[PDB]
């Protein structure tokens, strides 16, 4: 299969600041609403036959 290559970002040091989990869930909930209408995009590749 073809997929887009999501490279890693640079491994900046893992600070353990819990607050990051909230802003990750805020973005995931916006992305889950967007997964209704954005489905045509290259970021929405479904596993082809």
């Amino acid at each position: 299969q073809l997929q887009v290559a999501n490279l890693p970002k640079d491994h900046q040091i893992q600070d353990s600041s819990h607050h990051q989990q909230i802003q990750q869930q805020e973005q995931q909930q916006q992305q889950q609403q967007q997964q209704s209408t954005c489905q045509d995009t290259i970021f929405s590749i479904k596993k082809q036959k």
Partner: protein
Amino acid sequence: KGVHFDSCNLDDLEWRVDDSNANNDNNGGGGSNQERSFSLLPLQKTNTP
């Protein structure tokens, strides 16, 4: 292989329709019953078949 149970009375099964795009949104939203190809029919309260 090729043998079953002679009798099964277990009618209260957790039947669902599943929606193929529902990846992210852990939200209690009343989704619009317009986009589905299918719907699960009600069990009638007529005489036992």
